[PDB]
């Protein structure tokens, strides 16, 4: 599905923090908060070259 992995709101925390520069889910009350997204290397994220 073309919406696989795009169904989240994530933003990179920044450059000055000692964490990987990856989009992370906002929130604060669940496991998904602060987790990587929108990446082929990330769990529950996109895959490289989605099949068309």
């Amino acid at each position: 599905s073309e919406k696989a992995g795009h169904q989240t709101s994530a933003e990179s925390w920044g450059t000055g923090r000692a964490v990987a520069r990856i989009p992370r889910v906002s929130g604060g009350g669940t496991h998904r908060a602060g987790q990587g997204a929108f990446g082929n290397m990330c769990r529950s994220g996109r895959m490289f070259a989605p099949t068309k």
């Binding site: 925390w13 920044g14 450059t15 000055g16 923090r17 000692a18 964490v19 602060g34």
Partner: peptide, 27 residues
């Protein structure tokens, strides 16, 4: 410096200041 209590923080640290910049070895 993004170390100690300031390592892996979403936003502004406890340092009360108008403008701040976080640093690391990568940068």
């Amino acid at each position: 410096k993004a170390t100690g209590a300031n390592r892996g923080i979403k936003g502004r640290p406890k340092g009360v200041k108008g403008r701040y910049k976080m640093v690391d070895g990568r940068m």
